[PDB]
Design a protein around this ligand. Structure first.
Ligand code: CDL
Ligand code: CDL
Ligand code: CDL
Ligand code: CDL
Ligand code: PC1
Ligand code: PC1
Ligand code: PC1
Ligand code: LPP
Ligand code: ADP
Lengths: 125, 51, 177, 505, 178, 102, 125, 136
């Protein structure tokens, strides 16, 4: 490989050529080396962590809500279900009604949060 | 010299068995004709290789 | 590595640049690449992959923009019909509006046709028109929420730049004649 | 205001939904294999078949919900990516953002996922049609074919890899994998005895086209050693190679997506297949071919006249429409309707990557839902009235009013009334065809929407109306809640999908 | 083979067609071994006509082993025989033999139906009894079943591991200086 | 995943389970065959993992020699009259004079 | 006008009363099929004429070579046979207008350089 | 890109588009296809040099990007068909400004090659427009 610093002298090259092929600022060199000119690897990692957490929350909530709804409303015919729910205690009725809705709604809200970019610092005027 | 002989043999064999392989009624005949069909296919591959 | 497919034609190829003669059936993979397959398959082959993706998007947006011109002029005609009584309606329409309606016909705007048959020159002109509109918008930074994405620091810098530009434009004197 | 969080959430959701499905399938299969010495149903209330049915149904459903979320994320991501590329005009600035993969799950087949609107539409069709078909096949699976409860999960995984891959070879392999599960379902689950021959016809007819597509793929791979599906931009095929590739691709994918004269297998299979699997076949399995044809023909540069292909598609439409009248069998009539719609869709793809693709995609979606509706109605008729022939079935409305109402509304939707994606797709295709070749457009519209429509409506109206005086001791009752809600959901989708964002259409 | 200032460049591996031929032979032998092991596990006197394919209509392992072996011999994509056929077609395309590809495809499709038609006969009115009786009970051989299971696994998932087999076959053929 | 020994152990376990299911015997029959199958599978697949890489390395080395054969085979395959043509004359002299270093 | 006596070559069922058919193709089911038991599992005896009509078309076949051309009407059969050719010729004549004007032509347009519709194009670090 | 400013513009910044000649487009496309190796080499060598001598304390820190000079000169010669000088420094005055912009893009701002190829192609286009019949 002939592309190396070996054998190169600043005397051979003109001053304008050296200025042209001069290293930029140290900060610019570091950004270019680390590929952090626009976004930092830590920002990417934080975004990925939030994405994974959001997916796990959404999927778990959807599964819980679906299964709870199925098992609570899959006990038999209309008469049987109505009688079972009538004999059901107050707190048991509340959970049976609220668990599936809350799980599904939380999943949908977490989904909506990502597309809605409210946390933007330019809110003014 | 081998290429033309192989091609002629392959063509004749294919056009001769296309109808015979559907005339058998025996398990042994089925096995033998499976071997024959695979042999013809490998002969075509051999022609391609020697090209 | 790219390869080639054996050729059967018995034609002769004369390459004046390299000063050699070949035969179509005798070409190898690299020779096939150099002589055959060297034709262009896009409006602007000179552009890179990223540049041509931008060109394609601008062309699509420009076609939609011309269709938007047609839709806007149609809406204006409806507005004229509702506001103005049938008397004097055609008299007032026989003006800029009618000429624009005719000038935005199918050859110039692809209303519902599958393809707008445009030469590469026409596509370049449409992309240039879209880029001119984009430049005019970006002068004042009207594309932050729509037709653009920027960070908070970028938005602040753009606001300061637009403020300076507006101040300078206002301070400039009126154009003579 | 678009931020990297949305990008990573989109990518993570797309990647992880596949593994959700795969882990569900893996756990269910492990339970099934290791719970019993012999993998057949134990005819008692405590069988593992109930658990497997529950797992399959509510894995498909939950994955469908997650797919809705991921598809919405993709729509936002693609729109904002186009905006990022288009907006900036400064020469120094360029959009070069690089994403780092997660460290939790690996990339299946070491491939970076790439998603498109057409692919996600195809995946959504897979989910919904698979849900309907699995709901249909409950009465068919009994005590030796329970192993086929996982067929739709396998289909979903295959389609997921098919639509989320940027590799030509993986694309082709996913396309070719669909044969085995479908053949096994038709062979072991179909009640009719003619299904045995129908399965062989299906296999041979589809495999001929599969071999054609295989030859085309071999031409592409051997000539261009690349497999990334994007290096083809830097390689140009000569005229002869390009014409051979397009001919092979069109014929091979038209063997699957029925085209004239290659629809004999489709008619046979639809007539003799399970009523629950016919829904899945017509709705989805004929559109993977369209998706593959679109991908290949838009990637390759073709400098040939498409008049021959357009003529083939139009001939198929005309043939199916003319034959609609002479069918007293409702299932065969619906099969001819499927052939007609598929040929129109295929015609929508005969102008390369022009705007016809949007109408083609919308028409593919509407045809999937409409065919599912029609085959489900035929299934209900056949299951409650023990026949699906017009001579033996008459006056459905007067004994089963809900079923007759469903038939009538199905006919209205099939007619293409405004306010339906069917009408929107017809409008797209006909608006393009009017400028492409107005006389051909007139002939196609006339035939399909008058002669074929009248032939289609004759049998359905005759079945719906009349007076059921025969076999009064054996008349059924009505649709069930499951059937009624399936019909309602089909209608609801056909109506409300017209409000989907117009950016992608 | 390209020449650039008397420097030869070879992007083609000559000892590749032989490796593909060896791969096809090995794949056919493996599938033949699978089907013959299924036959040997059972009573041999029952199978004497194509109609007797119904006699394979026995417990799920034998039934589905036969079905998948027949499909693999036919060349259905996911199975083992498809790999050999696809690689033969790929090498033919690489060598630019369109007529050979045409004839290979004709033979392949005809043979495919030839294998497939037996699936029609596999259907049986009842369950067959093709096992030999020993000690008053049917004799099922665990060793042959295990060998059939390994063959079934490789028949199903040959595509996944085919790269290693291709590497080994190319390594073997590279010694030949042709 | 990454350990070929563990992969082979899992393969042997599943092979034993599948063999029991196919034979229609309880999965707990002949329990001693589970560790036997796991060990045999692990060892054989570990050896094959080593062998495939050795074969790949030797194949890469053999391709170097095969390149020499291809270059000389191409020159000898030239049709009569082409060995002294302007497109092959220099290469033919290189292989017939410079490489005649015995 | 169509009557059975004078139709000649436009076949149709005869008006004369006939005895029911003794043998006819019937529904057959796969061995060990699971019965369909919707709505109480009540099956009525099938009418022989109706079953015969159900299975007649599937088994109908041409008796002699070339009967297809003569059956029905020769002119209509030839027109149906040539329909694909007519469609192709109409398409080509229409494409002549497109060529001479400048409108849409029957070709695989390649405006996008292999860029699929709304595809995600990204790179990884 | 491909936009010319309006000389007599009422407001500060106005641009009117133009379409390059088919000959210019063909020349640029052919030369890019032939010389694309040099541009990828420039990118890879830029990254390599930054890694090797990016640190201030490095011995070769005072020779930054000089090894890229040979690649840049080769790319210029390939794009210009060996005419108009054998080095980038010999670029004609018509393309000198675009050459300076390209150098600023590549080595000082360290912008993406997607951006800097625009300026390099602008240099080539300036030369081609200036000469016309000399390049073809
Ligand atoms: C007790 C065993 C427990 C096993 C638990 C799971 C562990 C893995 C399996 C290990 C088994 C080892 C021993 C062999 C047993 C099988 C043979 C036998 O003789 O059994 C007799 C034994 C007893 O006899 P029997 O049950 O009476 O006989 C019935 C017959 O065997 C008939 O039964 P069947 O009809 O159910 O058989 C399956 C049927 C149909 O089976 C299938 O279709 C398999 C579907 C698997 C689900 C996922 C598919 C996803 C596809 C997406 C698209 C990919 C495209 C890639 C490009 C190339 C094309 C693939 O036939 C086929 O498989 C042929 C088609 C093959 C298609 C190729 C698909 C390749 C997918 C590769 C994995 C991708 C993973 C991605 C995610 C991870 C990324 C890092 O049989 C059984 O107990 C049941 C066996 C059923 C199959 C088991 C495996 C299915 C689940 C696989 C999950 C893991 C993925 C696959 C990769 C595995 C590692 C390579
Ligand atoms: C992608 C396409 C791929 C296509 C693949 C096609 C072939 C697939 C199926 C066949 C594969 C071989 C299966 C193993 C041999 C069969 C017998 C056996 O082991 O089961 C009986 C035996 C059953 O034991 P048992 O039920 O307790 O008692 C049985 C009797 O009661 C009492 O038993 P016994 O006392 O009567 O007999 C005891 C003896 C019975 O076993 C035997 O006697 C072996 C019989 C086979 C001999 C030929 C093996 C050749 C292996 C090399 C690769 C070619 C394979 C070709 C196979 C097909 C040939 C037609 O057991 C053993 O010792 C087993 C050792 C097996 C490994 C032998 C390795 C020899 C390597 C020689 C060459 C080395 C490299 C040289 C390089 C030179 C360079 C200059 O097996 C076991 O104990 C473990 C079973 C569960 C794990 C099986 C794991 C199999 C792994 C196969 C790896 C294949 C290569 C890697 C993959 C390549 C593709 C990517
Ligand atoms: C980093 C690596 C990552 C990847 C993983 C890699 C590793 C994967 C493998 C993982 C597993 C490792 C296993 C290590 C030991 C392997 C030994 C070996 O060589 O295997 C082959 C060999 C079996 O093959 P074979 O019997 O020679 O084959 C004959 C043919 O089938 C021919 O059939 P046949 O019909 O002609 O005859 C049938 C057979 C009928 O006979 C049989 O059934 C075979 C014998 C079975 C019983 C053996 C005695 C068990 C009790 C004493 C064990 C030794 C002391 C252990 C002390 C442990 C202290 C911590 O005939 C015979 O008797 C012939 C063989 C003569 C006797 C051979 C005695 C071998 C002893 C091996 C001891 C190994 C452990 C040593 C530990 C030393 C520690 C310092 O030995 C065994 O497998 C022994 C049985 C081990 C499994 C027992 C399973 C049932 C009981 C489970 C109780 C669990 C309680 C705790 C539950 C905790 C959770 C709640
Ligand atoms: C190439 C140059 C073109 C430009 C020049 C000008 C146009 C000249 C065209 C040629 C016209 C003269 C030749 C036609 C002779 C008739 C056809 C024939 O030969 O088949 C055997 C002929 C028909 O056998 P069949 O159809 O099996 O008999 C059925 C039974 O009658 C039982 O019947 P059914 O009671 O069940 O009722 C069914 C009936 C009624 O069926 C229906 O109601 C359903 C609709 C049927 C189609 C009606 C025509 C619709 C428009 C067709 C447009 C085609 C466009 C594509 C082709 C373009 C080619 C440029 O079906 C028929 O129509 C059968 C009658 C014969 C076909 C008549 C219609 C097609 C004739 C060809 C037209 C070509 C037009 C080209 C120009 C187009 C504009 C640019 O057999 C007989 O001879 C028996 C008597 C049939 C009635 C004959 C009435 C007099 C016809 C003129 C006689 C003198 C001809 C002198 C020729 C001199 C040398 C050139
Ligand atoms: C419809 C038939 C029944 C259904 C089965 C389908 C079988 C046919 C499938 C389509 C095959 C392609 C036909 C169109 C070819 C168009 C290009 C062409 O040949 O023009 C001359 C082409 C185009 O030439 P050109 O004039 O356009 O430009 C090049 C001109 N020269 C060379 C002079 C510079 O010329 C050639 O190079 C000859 C190529 C001939 C290739 C014919 C064999 C193809 C083999 C692979 C496919 C085999 C599939 C078999 C499937 C099983 C069948 C049972
Ligand atoms: C320092 C080393 C110390 C080592 C100490 C020794 C450790 C020994 C560990 C033994 C674990 C045994 C687990 C048995 C679980 C049984 C579950 C059950 O009930 O299933 C029955 C089920 C059902 O079987 P069935 O067929 O009887 O079904 C009954 C159900 N009805 C009635 C409906 C039919 O089947 C099974 O799963 C049993 C067979 C599979 C057993 C698999 C054992 C794998 C053991 C792996 C050991 C790995 C060790 C690695 C060491 C590495 C060291 C470096
Ligand atoms: C009820 C109303 C009915 C209305 C009429 C419906 C259609 C009637 C039939 C129209 C025929 C049109 C023929 C001319 C078009 C030829 C297209 C072509 O280029 O094909 C070449 C084709 C091949 O085309 P190709 O595709 O290979 O061309 C190369 C590709 N391009 C063109 C893009 C470069 O060659 C043929 O095989 C043509 C065979 C023609 C056989 C003779 C046909 C005579 C038809 C006479 C009709 C009666 C007179 C007209 C009546 C109407 C007057 C108003
Ligand atoms: C139904 C709940 C769904 C929750 C949403 C995320 C699902 C992710 C897929 C899980 C698949 C099943 C387990 C697989 C185990 C395995 O073998 O997993 C093996 C692999 C290990 O991979 P590696 O070996 O490469 O490290 O597991 C993983 O990679 C990650 C597994 C998922 C981690 C999140 C667990 C969330 C737990 C939620 C508990 C509450 C659920 C309530 C439901 C009613
Ligand atoms: N399948 C049929 N095929 C042909 N003609 C029929 C058929 N059914 C009825 N017809 C006609 O119906 C008429 C007889 O009507 P029908 O209801 O049977 O009362 P009836 O036989 O007592 O006169 C005849 O003209 C007969 O030709």
């Amino acid at each position: 490989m002939n592309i190396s610093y070996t054998g190169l002298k600043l005397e051979d090259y003109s001053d304008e050529v050296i200025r042209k092929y001069k290293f930029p600022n140290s900060n610019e060199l570091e950004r270019f080396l680390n590929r952090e000119q626009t976004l930092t690897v830590q920002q990417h990692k934080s975004a990925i962590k939030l994405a994974q957490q959001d997916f796990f929350a959404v999927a778990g909530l959807l599964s819980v809500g679906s299964l709870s709804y199925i098992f609570y409303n899959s006990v038999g015919g209309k008469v049987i279900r109505d009688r079972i729910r009538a004999s059901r205690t107050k707190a048991q009725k509340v959970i049976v009604l609220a668990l599936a809705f809350v799980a599904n709604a939380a999943a949908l809200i977490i989904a909506r949060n990502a597309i809605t970019a409210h946390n933007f610092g330019w809110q003014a005027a | 010299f081998f290429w033309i002989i192989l091609l002629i043999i392959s063509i004749i064999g294919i056009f001769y068995i296309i109808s015979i392989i559907f005339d058998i009624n025996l398990f042994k005949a089925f096995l033998a004709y499976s071997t024959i069909i695979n042999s013809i296919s490998f002969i075509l591959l051999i022609i391609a290789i020697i090209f | 590595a790219f390869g080639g497919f054996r050729q059967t034609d018995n034609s002769l190829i004369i390459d004046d640049r390299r000063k050699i003669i070949l035969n179509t059936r005798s070409l190898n993979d690299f020779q096939q690449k150099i002589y055959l397959r060297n034709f262009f398959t896009n409006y602007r082959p000179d552009l890179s992959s990223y540049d041509y993706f931008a060109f394609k998007e601008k062309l699509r947006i420009g076609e939609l923009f011309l269709n938007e011109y047609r839709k806007r002029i149609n809406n204006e005609v409806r507005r004229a019909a509702i506001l103005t009584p049938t008397s004097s309606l055609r008299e007032k329409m026989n003006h800029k509006i009618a000429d624009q309606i005719l000038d935005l016909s199918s050859p110039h705007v692809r209303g519902a046709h599958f393809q707008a048959v445009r030469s590469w020159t026409d596509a370049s002109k449409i992309v240039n028109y879209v880029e001119e509109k984009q430049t005019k918008i970006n002068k004042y930074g009207l594309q932050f929420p729509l037709l653009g994405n920027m960070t908070e620091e970028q938005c602040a810098s753009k606001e300061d730049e637009v403020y300076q530009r507006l101040l300078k434009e206002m301070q400039k004197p009126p154009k003579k004649a | 205001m678009f931020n990297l969080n949305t990008i990573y959430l989109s990518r993570i959701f797309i990647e992880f939904n596949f593994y959700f499905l795969f882990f569900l399938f893996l756990i269910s299969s492990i339970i099934f294999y290791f719970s019993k010495i012999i993998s057949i149903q134990n005819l008692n209330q405590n069988s593992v078949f109930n658990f497997l049915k529950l797992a399959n149904i509510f894995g498909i459903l939950i994955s469908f919900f997650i797919h809705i979320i991921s598809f919405w994320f993709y729509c936002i991501y693609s729109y904002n990516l186009s905006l990022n590329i288009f907006s900036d005009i400064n020469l120094y600035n360029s959009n070069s953002i690089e994403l780092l993969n997660n460290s939790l799950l690996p990339n299946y087949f070491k491939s970076n996922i790439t998603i498109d609107f057409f692919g996600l539409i195809l995946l959504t069709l897979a989910y919904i049609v698979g849900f309907v078909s699995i709901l249909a096949l409950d009465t068919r699976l009994y005590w030796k074919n329970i192993k086929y409860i996982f067929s739709f999960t396998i289909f979903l995984l295959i389609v997921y890899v098919y639509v989320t891959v940027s590799n030509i070879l993986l694309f082709f392999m996913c396309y070719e994998l669909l044969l085995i599960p479908s053949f096994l379902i038709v062979y072991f689950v179909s009640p009719s005895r003619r299904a045995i021959q129908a399965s062989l016809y299906f296999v041979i007819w589809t495999q001929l086209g599969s071999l054609l597509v295989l030859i085309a793929i071999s031409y592409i791979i051997s000539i261009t050693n690349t497999y990334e599906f994007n290096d083809l931009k830097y390689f140009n095929f000569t005229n002869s190679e390009s014409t051979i590739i397009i001919f092979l691709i069109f014929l091979g994918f038209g063997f699957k997506a029925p085209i004239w004269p290659f629809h004999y297998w489709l008619t046979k299979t639809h007539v003799e297949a399970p009523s629950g699997f016919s829904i899945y076949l017509s709705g989805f399995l004929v559109k993977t071919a369209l998706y593959g044809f679109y991908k290949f023909n838009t990637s390759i540069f073709i400098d040939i006249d498409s008049s021959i292909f357009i003529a083939i598609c139009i001939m198929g439409v005309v043939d199916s429409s003319l034959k609609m009248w002479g069918q007293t069998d409702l299932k065969k009539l619906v099969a001819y309707g499927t052939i007609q719609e598929m040929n129109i869709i295929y015609l929508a793809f005969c102008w390369g990557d022009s705007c016809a693709i949007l109408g083609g995609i919308l028409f593919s979606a509407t045809h999937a839902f409409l065919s599912a509706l029609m085959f489900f109605l035929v299934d209900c008729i056949y299951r409650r009235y023990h026949t699906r022939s017009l001579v033996e079935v008459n006056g459905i409305l007067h004994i089963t009013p809900n079923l007759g109402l469903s038939i009538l509304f199905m006919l209205v939707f099939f007619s293409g009334i405004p306010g339906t994606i069917k009408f929107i797709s017809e409008f797209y295709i006909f608006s393009g065809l009017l400028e492409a070749s107005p006389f051909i457009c007139f002939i196609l519209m006339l035939v399909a929407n008058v002669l074929g429509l009248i032939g289609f409506s004759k049998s359905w109206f005759n079945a719906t109306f009349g007076m059921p005086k025969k076999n009064t001791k054996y008349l059924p009752m009505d649709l069930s809640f499951k059937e009624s809600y399936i019909i309602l959901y089909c209608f609801f989708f056909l109506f409300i999908f017209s409000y989907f964002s117009s950016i992608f259409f | 083979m390209s020449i650039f200032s008397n420097i030869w460049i070879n992007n083609d591996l000559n000892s590749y067609g032989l490796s593909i031929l060896l791969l096809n032979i090995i794949n056919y032998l493996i599938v033949f071994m699978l089907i013959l092991s299924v036959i040997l596990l059972t009573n041999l006197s029952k199978f004497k006509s194509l109609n007797q394919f119904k006699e394979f209509n026995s417990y799920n392992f034998i039934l589905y082993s036969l079905i998948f072996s027949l499909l693999s011999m036919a060349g259905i994509p996911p199975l083992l025989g498809f790999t050999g056929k696809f690689l033969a077609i790929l090498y033919s395309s690489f060598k630019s033999q369109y007529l050979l590809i045409l004839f290979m495809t004709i033979l392949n499709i005809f043979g495919m139906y030839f294998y497939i038609q037996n699936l029609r006969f596999v259907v049986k009115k009842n369950k067959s009894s093709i096992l030999n009786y020993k000690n008053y009970y049917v004799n099922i051989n665990y060793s042959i079943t295990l060998n059939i299971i390994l063959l079934n696994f490789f028949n199903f998932f040959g595509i996944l591991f085919l790269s290693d087999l291709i590497i080994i076959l190319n390594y073997i053929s590279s010694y030949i200086y042709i | 995943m990454s350990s070929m020994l563990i992969w082979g152990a899992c393969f042997g376990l599943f092979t034993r389970a599948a063999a029991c299911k196919a034979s229609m015997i309880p999965l707990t029959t002949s329990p001693w065959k589970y560790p036997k199958y796991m060990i045999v599978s692990a060892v054989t697949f570990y050896y094959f993992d080593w062998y495939r890489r050795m074969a790949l390395e030797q194949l890469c080395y053999n391709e170097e020699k095969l390149e020499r054969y291809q270059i000389r085979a191409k020159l000898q395959s030239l049709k009569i009259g082409e060995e002294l043509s302007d497109a092959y004359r220099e290469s033919f002299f290189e292989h017939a004079v410079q490489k005649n270093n015995i | 006008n169509y009557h059975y006596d004078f139709c000649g070559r436009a076949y149709m069922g005869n008006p004369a009363v006939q005895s029911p058919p003794k043998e006819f193709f019937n529904y057959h089911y796969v061995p060990d099929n699971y019965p369909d038991a919707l709505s109480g599992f009540r099956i009525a005896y099938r009418d022989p004429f109706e079953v015969q009509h159900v299975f007649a078309y599937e088994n109908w076949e041409y008796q002699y070579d070339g009967q297809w051309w003569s059956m029905g009407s020769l002119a209509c059969n030839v027109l149906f046979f040539c329909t694909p050719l007519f469609l192709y010729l109409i398409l080509q004549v229409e494409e002549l207008n497109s060529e001479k004007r400048g409108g849409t032509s029957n070709k695989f347009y390649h405006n996008n350089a292999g860029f699929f519709h709304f595809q995600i194009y990204d790179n990884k670090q | 890109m491909f936009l010319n400013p309006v000389k007599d513009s009422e407001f500060d910044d106005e641009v009117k588009g133009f379409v390059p000649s088919e000959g210019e487009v063909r020349f640029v496309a052919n030369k890019n296809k032939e010389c694309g190796y040099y541009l990828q080499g420039i990118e890879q060598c830029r990254r390599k040099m930054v890694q090797l001598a990016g640190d201030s304390s490095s011995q070769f820190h005072s020779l930054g990007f000089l090894p890229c000079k040979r690649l840049v000169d080769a790319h210029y010669r390939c794009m210009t068909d060996d005419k108009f000088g054998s080095t980038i420094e010999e670029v004609p005055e018509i393309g000198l400004d675009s050459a300076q912009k390209f150098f600023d893009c590549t080595f000082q701002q360290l912008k993406p090659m997607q951006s800097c190829r625009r300026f390099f192609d602008q240099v080539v286009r300036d030369v081609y427009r200036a000469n016309g019949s000399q390049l073809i």
